[PDB]
Amino acid sequence: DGPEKNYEKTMAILQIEAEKAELRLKELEVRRLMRARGDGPWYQYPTIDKALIDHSPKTTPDN
Amino acid sequence: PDSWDKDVYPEPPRRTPAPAPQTSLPNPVTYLTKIFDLLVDRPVTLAREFIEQQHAKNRYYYYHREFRRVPDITECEEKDILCMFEAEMQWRRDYKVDQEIVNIIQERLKACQQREGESYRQNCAKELEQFTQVSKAFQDRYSDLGAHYSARKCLAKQKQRMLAERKAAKEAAAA
């Protein structure tokens, strides 16, 4: 075939790989920040559910 | 022949002496040339004429590919891979063109040296000067880049040379 086919195929491939590399760097940074802080959906370790607490008079005023 | 342009490959007018037979002894060179012409050049010329007339009955063309200009690596972003790719391919094509230019100059130098005979040291001074200039330019451009050469490395070499020469010029002017 002609050179334009290989030229444009290489251009598309280069775009795909560059986007993938940038996405991988962003993923690593996001993971590091998320584990360090814990304010995102990832790395949310469970805590005690508050629906288990009994809110009723307890035979003693001071709980 | 018109197959190659005369200006790019110059040739002197190639003046030749005239036969001045001092004696009546017949030289064998002329007789041998005549017989060689008679029984070699004629059949070859007829065969070539036949082949050429066969070619003329079916004529078709092929064209030289023209390439557009694209932005260099100097106006290419840091991580813009597409512009970097285009600039790199353009730089490689320019590299090949420069190599062929140097090849042309070398061919002219060799032809002049062989043609001038025993006075080559004097009569081909211009060709040697042209080759010296082109070789210095090529060495400044592309030499020492390494096996993994690229447009970025050539640009870095040019920048370093520009810094060196600017510092030298500033030091000379301020002196």
Distance from chain centroid for Cα B115: 17
* CB–CB contact A11 B89 (8 Å): no
Residue B121 phi/psi, 5-degree rounding, is -65, -25
Burial class (CB in 10 A: 0-12, 13-18, 19+), B157: middle
CB contact at 8 A, B153 and B160? no
**Shortest distance, CA A44 to any CA of chain B (angstroms):** 35
The span from the CA of B76 to the CA of B167, in Å, is: 27
Instruction: List, in sequence order, every beta strand (DSSP E) within B9-75.
Output: none
* CB–CB contact B81 A18 (8 Å): yes
The DSSP secondary-structure symbol of B35 reads H
Give the experimental resolution in Å. Answer: 3.3
**If we measure between CA atoms, which residue out of B87, B54, B89 comes closest to residue B71?**
B87
CB contact at 8 A, B123 and B149? no
Q: Given CA atoms B70, B76, B82, B84 in this order, what sign does their dihedral have?
A: positive
A18 chain-B contacts, CB cut-off 8 A: 79, 81
For residue A21, give the chain B residue with the closest CA: B79
CB contact at 8 A, B112 and B104? no
**Which tokens belong to B96?**
């090949």
* CB–CB contact B85 A11 (8 Å): yes
CB contact at 8 A, A41 and A47? no
- Dihedral (C-alpha) A24, A29, A35, A40: value to the nearest 10 degrees? -90
The span from the CA of B84 to the CA of B76, in Å, is: 6
The span from the CA of B11 to the CA of B6, in Å, is: 7
CB contact at 8 A, B86 and B71? yes
**Which tokens belong to B67?**
């390439």
The span from the CA of B111 to the CA of B116, in Å, is: 9
**Long-range residue pairs from B26-29, CB within 8 A, at least 24 positions apart, any chain:** none
Residues in chain A: 63
The span from the CA of A25 to the CA of A48, in Å, is: 35
AA letter at B166: R
The DSSP secondary-structure symbol of A51 reads G
- Dihedral (C-alpha) B116, B118, B123, B128: value to the nearest 10 degrees? 90
B81 chain-A contacts, CB cut-off 8 A: 14-15, 17-18
CB contact at 8 A, B107 and B99? no
| CA B33 vs CA B27, B38, B40: distances in Å | 11, 9, 10
Burial class (CB in 10 A: 0-12, 13-18, 19+), B63: exposed
